[PDB]
Subunit: 134 residues, 3 copies
């Protein structure tokens, strides 16, 4: 079949941040008509989720992430760097998500958006979109 | 190679519900002999996991989801709709899971079943099974 | 295209354990030059994450998993077997992760390693690496 590999960067504006990257991903899949887009970050302290980018919810993801794994929590990693919480929550959520491609477009539900969740910003994060199909 | 795309629906019976959808997924992969099945929901308030569908555990997934992200919790999203908890826990778990296909069948471990977890039911949920391989 | 399917085993040394399996996965993808590696376990009580294998963090993943879903917690599943916590946390994290392959090598970020997280050891765990691409 066919394999497309394209990367783009986004600048996170705070320690905790959430960015809707759907538009950038739709550009990155060009070349594939029907298949699968793997939205991947080669980072260990930020994650990718597919959900609703409503204003309040964009805050909720971060605030609940903080509730589940408090940045002020106890982390053996923090002996070296103070972002153990970012590593832990990011590992649980995952560093990738799949989005089907159909008719050359992202096949998303009514309320689905591709979102990058940052837990150790501000930073320039790189997103790799590796698509496969025909 | 080959790309199969098939959808099926399941009716959730409660706000919190868990449904073993393995049989429906085994039908949806027909056409692919060796490859990968991406079990995807284009929903933002329900998720997909691959685990054991034992009776008690089917309750545990829901009860622990509730413990981690209480529906009665504080959500800025709830200003618009009262399902912020469903959005949050679903984003963390993920809206898809991969299952390998071999010999035309789902390659599952002894205790593995494909399970749909509902956090904002009752609703008719749609599952997309996008398979790729030969 | 091409489909490679290779399995390897790792012995977990404790109830809770974390093992860097990156090297074994790099061997298992041989045959694929450009594509996607799906690192999968057909188990229901251990999970796969892609993150930093720093010494302290390797402990943090396990300790925070324990904090989120206490093994001593209430599980209806424990009427049959006392590993309900392992099932729950493993379902949330997921039983697979994707790693892109480029130039015949795992395309990993500076701090990324493929890690197996065990919550019901000691056991011999099997990892399936199903790769697709050219
Ligand atoms: Zn760190
Ligand atoms: Zn909502
Ligand atoms: Zn069990």
């Amino acid at each position: 079949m066919k394999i497309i590999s394209k990367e783009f960067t986004v600048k996170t504006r705070s320690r905790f941040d959430s960015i809707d990257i759907t538009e950038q991903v739709s550009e990155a899949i060009k070349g594939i008509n029907n298949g699968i887009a793997h939205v991947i970050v080669k980072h260990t302290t930020c994650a990718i989720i597919i959900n609703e980018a409503e204003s309040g919810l964009m805050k909720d993801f971060l605030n609940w992430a903080k509730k589940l794994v408090p940045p002020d929590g106890e982390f053996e990693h923090n002996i070296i760097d103070n972002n153990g919480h970012a590593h832990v929550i990011s590992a649980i959520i995952g560093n990738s998500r799949v989005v089907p491609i159909i008719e050359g477009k992202l096949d998303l539900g009514t309320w689905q958006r591709i979102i990058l969740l940052e837990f150790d910003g501000p930073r320039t994060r790189t997103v790799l979109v590796k698509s496969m199909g025909e």
